[PDB]
Write a protein that binds this ligand. Structure first.
Ligand SMILES: Nc1ncnc2c1ncn2[C@H]1C[C@H](O)[C@@H](COP(=O)(O)OP(=O)(O)OP(=O)(O)O)O1
Ligand SMILES: Cc1cn([C@H]2C[C@H](O)[C@@H](COP(=O)(O)OP(=O)(O)OP(=O)(O)O)O2)c(=O)[nH]c1=O
Ligand SMILES: Cc1cn([C@H]2C[C@H](O)[C@@H](COP(=O)(O)OP(=O)(O)OP(=O)(O)O)O2)c(=O)[nH]c1=O
Ligand SMILES: [Mg+2]
Ligand SMILES: [Mg+2]
Lengths: 715, 737
């Protein structure tokens, strides 16, 4: 009897490690929610659930689990792509009666005029390549649904995005289709949510100079934020030009209440417009309201600092910092580095300061905020501007929400970003050699994609659109760096890892540029190209004084770029990639495993998950048991103190806490020479003291990092 | 013992010189109850040796005012002492003070900051001659201590602490500020202000003849529409107007309901409540020591009304509160009919049910029904339920104000423009607003007790002439005001509305010796307001001749010879020939769509010494805080002191009685009659009187209701009464106790 269930679980067991997967186990839990009443479709989830719990015994359960629920999706959705599309278009909302197409006619009509070539391109066996928690992610949000029931299979949705990008160009579409569905990279969420629809808001982040220091200013800027958040976008906002508390107002002959009351207005605007807000506010440490600033998360806004070098210099030489009001001392954010230290001091040597503190004391109020709340983020204004390819445009006033994007912004330019990410774990061949020829190749495609995205994209406000058209900046990231190192057999901190880290990024960048060049050959450079460091032969690694390894002939590439230029002001920026890395079963971005154990909620409750790579070594060596697992939870996810585990692995699966943050910082410093934008650097300090922190910032600062620190994590 | 004189010159104490100086300022005062040796005695104890001769003026004017409780003359005397001080501390010649104020260099910020406009100076200056000798400083001695200290606290200009302006220099600046090179009229206005016949609204008082003049107090807005973009555009406007110290009232009914579908995002609308948080947050943050004030107007067919209703509570949950906005209801006739006949009432989304707010009266009644019929409703409730909800809101908070859309639109001369979607912060202004037009209003009030004579007869003929003047002034303001936003300016030049108000109405009855509630008082109330409407139309007519109609005149009720009182079916008394005027208009047209708008004269009433607006006394005994002082109704005290009926315990037995004189066995009834508090008076009678005067007020009236012990019965009956009277504003605040 339960035999009829088992022999059916078994069907989807192909290629799985049957030392550790045992279908009999599931059946024993499933056969009990059985009765004369419901049957198969119900029991289908039942088993998927059960299987999914069992992930703790073996990673293959996640995959088995996945497969079952997938089988069941297929058993309840249309096969033919064009036919699924047809339904999404037609959907009359039978609620009111008005027609509401879920895809866009043009994408429909493109799809139908090639129903032949697109339909038979889709390989639906590719829906089994996702793990459970990955699949469930898609099913919650990424797969389009008519009234309850999901319509799109994951292939459908990929094909949709693909043609949603390459429109009339089928070839480019089917090659993007493949790449994606084999999980060689991914687009940003907005792209996957929106490509092929009526509101194709694909970009994924915006930046924003505060238009002007008046009510009129503050409220136009506010109108804009509301508008971007409407159509999804995250925002960075440059706020430093707003006059401080006490600063006189001529028009009303009153006295301004300063930056904070104004940050309340914005906060409140984020609680409103949603589809929760998310603004990063960037303040410069010379602003007279910087102290109140540091108490605010100490609320729907994240604070970040636009640090000028001068400030770091003064802090380390126990010194005199002078807080100014931007009304009283104009243009202080319109300038960086040299011209800043001249202009700033000029105001100091002119008396015109509102209040002097010791540099060191401000510093320590920062360390206080970070230990409390994990914020403010630390970004170095001078580093960012010095190594920016957009420096010919002016002074770069701030960054995006996750500190990775560094772009110019003005009264009439609001910077945007279009992002995507390469799955580094996919390029390590089954020989523990890393395939770079293939990595470069895929980047070049991602560039063409992102580049196409600029023109088709829906822009929420006009100067988002004006910005992006002038400088055509893109942003390309990575995920699974950690899994790459593990699949290679490399302790994250090993010299072996440390080289690979450079090499990977020498490659991503080589390809990006090379592809950006071919596009410039094809359609000319972006119009604010000539004037920039690349018209001058100075690529990103030069600005760092790094000479790359002989892996690629940059000699040859520079001669190309000298001939036809590039298409995009900027290209690379490794980002958090939180939501996508969940689908692909990867560790987020460039960071180690925070723990070797963690959970994940899925509708009702959670599932307990051990590091997939890890569990596979412990079980094969027959070291996996009850209390074995129960102990690692006791050690917050480390295995260092568990006695019967080899030397080999204790090294291989060190958690981020057990890793040297100095080393982490140094490694970013390395790769960051081939990242033309910035990177989202979290810092993990187990037991913090103000000492450890202070050298951290200082170490990373000395390394010359564009972003010093995204989040500080403490416990 | 000695006193330091006005020059550092030690002078021994000589207490007769105090009494002597006081006596010098008792011209015209009834000396039988004003013993000025009483102050002397009370001064020379609160008095150490070496104290400044200037402090023996403050200490003395302070003492003098705490004796209002003996004879109101004392309160006038207390001022006289403070003014006889100020004059000594001030430059006499007007044109000199104007020089200082301009040439004033900011002693902190080394740069320069005029306090008058260059033009205002260059006029005053090139007109030194006439203007200087025009001013009568013997008018500064005609206020009482309380009016005076309000003036002193914000209405005269301070050069670095030191009050530069004398009250006449102020009055004068304002006149030139309105009249520029028109020196004949500046002087005529100065005379009518300084003789206390009327007062301009505070924003005019403040800014008149300064640079970038914010002369107007009130602004009306309609939301820009169901959009994140509309919302934030209307918010920038509100911010911009609030920075210019302007009061605001807003039409918010078009906004999607909590739940309503949002196309572009597939998500769903969070409703009015969340948006109103954003409006509170902005009101808090933009200013004018004073936070901006928005009145929010909702129509009772909107799905979010119940939430709208608990938002003013100080009891509930932090997330759904907004104690900084003021809530109002724009009420269709239908809702009221539905209530008194226990029928159901449907709540809609303006998204699934467009056009509701852009249409009134039967046009509405038709459109609303055909939605109900169509099943276009999100929730359907018993009408009485909503009405119960409304009246506990009022019981707990005193809000929402109660406006009747159908009255306002039916009886408005802006009718030819479209639907009037809301009123203002104070509910007396009834003007049109659109995507392109924010209605400003410019206001002033007449001191209604100035026009009653020694022989207890009223001077309507004079009241009509003063009104004419005001209209000419309020008109010029429109052309000199600096508009916070362009749509404000658009509107005002298009329809040139003006709102003329009143203060000292209850004072007017008392001088004649009328109870508020008599046939006498109730005839005069009609007659007075006829007079104001008559005089004002006649003024606007003259201007039309001089200049042309207001652009949007043609097709209006007036351009058809329909005057406000026509819209009520009320024949005026025979006091004035309304057919002569009607003939005069159909000739030249008028210059201002709207004219009369009885607003609540909050602080200009404190100055002129008058009782607020259209209202009877709240008490015969009260407080004004400046030490806070113990004023007895000046009128009452006179009749008591005259009839030799005033002492310590009587003053007290009234405080015992919450300022009522009713129970006191020693007072003639015809006095107990005249001096009833508002908590004695019939509110129905109040509502009838407004309605009765309402036929002559082309806008509305801020109208509080006082009900002592309030229940559902009393609150309900009171609204419905006024409603059936044809009132546009049926209730401003509900005050209780
Ligand atoms: N010798 C005195 N003894 C008591 N009170 C005095 C004396 N001199 C003046 N005062 C009081 C009377 C008034 O209430 C108050 C202000 O009167 P005022 O005559 O303006 O002061 P003053 O005498 O210092 O100046 P002035 O030089 O103009 O006379 O001072
Ligand atoms: C008027 C006003 C301004 N502000 C703020 C907003 C701005 O940051 C700052 C003044 O900017 P503005 O609003 O532009 O004031 P202004 O142009 O009339 O005066 P000035 O030219 O001297 O700057 O103060 C308030 O917080 N509350 C207010 O009521
Ligand atoms: C987009 C968005 C709209 N809204 C509300 C506010 C507005 O009253 C209402 C109108 O939506 P809009 O802001 O105009 O968005 P839309 O253009 O998609 O609207 P429409 O469906 O008419 O095309 O939606 C939010 O509260 N939060 C949001 O994030
Ligand atoms: Mg300004
Ligand atoms: Mg819309």
């Amino acid at each position: 009897m339960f035999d009829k269930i088992t022999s059916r679980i078994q069907k989807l067991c192909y290629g799985l490690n049957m030392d550790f997967v045992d279908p009999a186990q599931i059946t024993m839990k499933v056969i009990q929610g059985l009765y004369s009443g419901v049957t198969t479709v119900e029991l289908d989830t039942l088993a998927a659930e059960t299987a999914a719990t069992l992930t703790t015994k073996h990673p293959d359960y996640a995959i088995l689990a996945a497969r079952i629920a997938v089988s069941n999706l297929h058993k309840e959705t249309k096969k033919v792509f064009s036919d699924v599309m047809e339904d999404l278009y037609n959907y009359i909302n039978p609620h009111n009666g008005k027609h509401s197409p879920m895809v866009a006619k043009s994408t429909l009509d493109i799809v139908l005029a090639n129903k032949d070539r697109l339909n038979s391109a889709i390989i639906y066996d590719r829906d089994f390549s996702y793990n459970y928690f990955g699949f469930k992610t898609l099913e919650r949000s990424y797969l389009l649904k008519i009234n309850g029931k999901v319509a799109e299979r994951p292939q459908h949705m990929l094909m949709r995005v693909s043609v949603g990008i390459h429109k009339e160009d089928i070839d480019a579409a089917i090659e993007t289709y493949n790449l994606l569905s084999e999980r060689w990279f991914t687009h940003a969420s907005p792209t996957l949510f929106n490509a092929g629809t009526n509101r194709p808001q694909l970009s994924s982040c915006f930046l924003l100079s505060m238009k002007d220091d008046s009510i009129e200013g503050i409220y136009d800027t506010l109108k804009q934020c509301a508008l971007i958040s409407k159509s999804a976008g995250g925002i960075g906002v440059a706020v430093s030009c707003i006059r401080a508390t006490g600063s006189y107002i001529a028009g009303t002959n009153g006295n301004s209440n300063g930056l904070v009351p104004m940050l309340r207005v914005y906060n409140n605007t984020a609680r409103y417009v949603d589809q929760p807000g998310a603004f990063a506010i960037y303040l410069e440490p010379w602003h007279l309201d910087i102290f109140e600033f540091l108490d605010l998360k100490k609320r729907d806004l994240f604070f970040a600092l636009w640090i000028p070098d001068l400030f770091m210099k003064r802090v380390e030489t126990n010194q005199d910092w002078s807080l100014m009001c931007p009304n009283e001392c104009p243009g202080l954010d319109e300038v960086w580095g040299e011209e800043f230290e001249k202009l700033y001091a000029s105001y100091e040597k002119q008396g015109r300061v509102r209040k002097v503190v010791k540099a060191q004391q401000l510093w320590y109020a920062i360390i206080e905020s970070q230990t409390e709340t994990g914020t403010p983020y630390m970004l170095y204004k001078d580093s960012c501007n010095r190594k920016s390819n957009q420096q010919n445009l002016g002074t770069i006033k701030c960054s995006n929400l996750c500190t990775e994007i560094v772009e110019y912004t003005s009264k009439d330019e609001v910077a945007v970003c279009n992002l995507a990410s390469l799955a580094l774990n996919m390029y390590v061949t089954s020989e523990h050699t890393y395939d770079f020829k293939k990595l470069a190749e895929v980047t070049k495609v991602v560039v063409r994609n992102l580049n196409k995205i600029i023109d088709i994209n829906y822009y929420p406000v006009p100067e988002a659109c004006l910005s992006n058209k002038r400088h055509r900046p893109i942003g390309i990231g990575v995920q699974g760096l950690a899994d790459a190192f593990i699949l290679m057999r490399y302790p994250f901190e090993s010299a072996e890892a440390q080289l690979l880290n450079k090499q990977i990024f020498e490659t991503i960048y080589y390809g990006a540029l090379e592809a950006s060049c071919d596009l410039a050959k094809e359609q000319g450079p972006y119009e604010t190209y000539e004037g920039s460091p690349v018209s001058k032969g100075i690529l990103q690694y030069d600005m760092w004084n790094v000479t790359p390894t002989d892996l690629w002939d940059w000699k040859v590439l520079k001669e190309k770029i000298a001939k036809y230029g590039i298409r995009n002001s900027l290209l690379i920026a490794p980002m958090p990639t939180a939501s996508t890395a969940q689908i692909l079963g990867n560790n987020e971005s460039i960071e180690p495993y925070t723990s070797n154990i963690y959970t994940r909620r899925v509708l009702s409750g959670e599932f307990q998950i051990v590091n997939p790579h890890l569990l596979k070594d412990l079980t094969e060596r027959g070291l996996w048991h009850e209390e074995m697992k129960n102990q690692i939870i006791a050690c917050n996810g480390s295995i260092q103190s568990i006695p019967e585990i080899p030397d080999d692995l204790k090294q291989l699966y060190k958690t981020v806490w057990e890793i040297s943050q100095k080393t982490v910082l140094k490694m970013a410093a390395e790769r960051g020479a081939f990242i033309d934008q910035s990177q989202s650097l979290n810092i993990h300090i187990a037991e913090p003291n103000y000492g450890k922190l202070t050298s951290m910032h200082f170490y990373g600062w000395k390394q010359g990092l564009k972003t010093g620190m995204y989040y500080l994590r403490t416990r």
